[PDB]
């Protein structure tokens, strides 16, 4: 089972280098090429360079030559990319891809790097119960508000992941150097508030795991 | 280095119909004998998935309905028939020489029957008041098409300052859109006024769906 496991999200200050790791499992690490691809948010794909885990052999894109350096450790079977002095135009999603000539077969999740020079802030979770008044019926919606956090992302979960079918998770939009994001779950009136529906919110930078039960107001 | 352009930039195709995607090249990638053109499918939040390599040869696990063709500079990808889970941005990449370049992007979207949004208004939580904030949330779930405008009204008068909007990507099953709007206000501004209405105009009906709540309860 061929897999590529990339590291988590990254928040960096301008003028600081960063290493991005890509763990490979399910195949012989030293026999296949590994290509690296950059993705500017809301834009296309950019090839950075390839690395052959066997021995020191790399070819880079001329646009990335003096910025990206590729290394691979054979013992840990991990491909690593260092990006020197990150700017505003470097805040992107970086991918690692396994290539068997001449197409990229397997991919990693992609590490979201944001630069970004702001302070890391704690998220605030708020439960959204239906409008005041003892029920309405048929099928009622529930919401979860995550107000004022930095940086991306926030993983939203409903009841640990059991009721994840009628869920609308909304992409985060930046306002005054702060991110805001919401999620809504639509369920039948028979299963609420008879069945306890909880909001599970996780944030990596602040290291906060706030769990809030939605109770009628 | 080798410019790859994709036409059209965006196409709308009904469920079960044929979609044509072109990929023009600035240099002949088919050099040496065979075409070195690859095709990818990328859903939002996910890495690109290889569909067809060398214009003709499909990757194992990819259905036969995904068909690619072309030689020299002109290349085409077709999906027949299309399904609900085909909502993605498709890319063509080239090997050959010399720094590897991706295409230009062509977003696929599905046309279906027009749907009316189920509007749900949510008052600020009791924990928001303690922190000093007041955010009124309004969810518009499962509607077609994407074109929709949300207008906030406080005590009969429109408010445009502090409105945060976010639109979701097309559903992988329903092929519908969803939107959320929030009035980022303070506790001081919230307690002065009483009525808060969430209004949305759509192509489905001339009358706007108005969902409102009173603080008086």
Residue numbers in the entry:
A (entry chain B): 501 to 717
B (entry chain A): 1 to 217
Q: What text does the study give?
A:
Chikungunya virus (CHIKV) is a mosquito-transmitted viral pathogen that causes fever, myalgia, rash, and severe arthritis in humans. The E1 glycoprotein participates in cell fusion, whereas the E2 glycoprotein binds to cellular receptors and initiates clathrin-dependent endocytosis. Most neutralizing antibodies bind to E2, as this glycoprotein is more exposed on the viral surface than E1. We also describe pseudo-atomic resolution structures of CHIK VLPs complexed with Fab fragments from four different neutralizing mouse monoclonal antibodies (MAb CHK-9, CHK-152, m10 and m242).
Four cryoEM structures were determined to ∼15 Å resolution of CHIK VLPs complexed with the Fab fragments of the neutralizing mouse MAbs CHK-9, CHK-152, m242 and m10. All Fab fragments bound the VLPs with one Fab fragment per E2 molecule. The crystal structures of CHK-9 and m242 Fab fragments were determined to 3.0 Å and 3.1 Å resolution, respectively. These Fab structures were fitted into the cryoEM maps of the corresponding VLP-Fab complexes. The coordinates of the E2 B domain in the VLPs did not agree well with the B domain density in the maps of the VLP complexed with the CHK-9 or m242 Fab fragments, suggesting that the E2 B domain had a different orientation in these Fab-bound structures than in the non-complexed VLPs. The footprint of CHK-9 and m242 Fabs onto the VLP localized primarily onto the domain A and did not include any part of domain B. Indeed, binding of these fragments to the VLPs had nudged domain B ∼10 Å sideways, out of the way of the Fab fragment. The height of the density for the variable domains of the Fab fragments was comparable to that of the CHIKV glycoprotein, suggesting a nearly 100% binding occupancy of the Fab fragments under saturating binding conditions. However, to block receptor attachment it is necessary to block all three receptor-binding sites on every spike. Such a stoichiometry would require substantially higher concentrations of Fabs to inhibit infectivity, as seen with CHK-9, m10 and m242 Fabs. In summary our structural studies suggest that the CHK-9, m10, and m242 Fab fragments neutralize CHIKV infectivity by blocking the cellular binding site on the A domain of E2 and that the CHK152 inhibits fusion by stabilizing domain B of E2, preventing exposure of the fusion loop on E1.
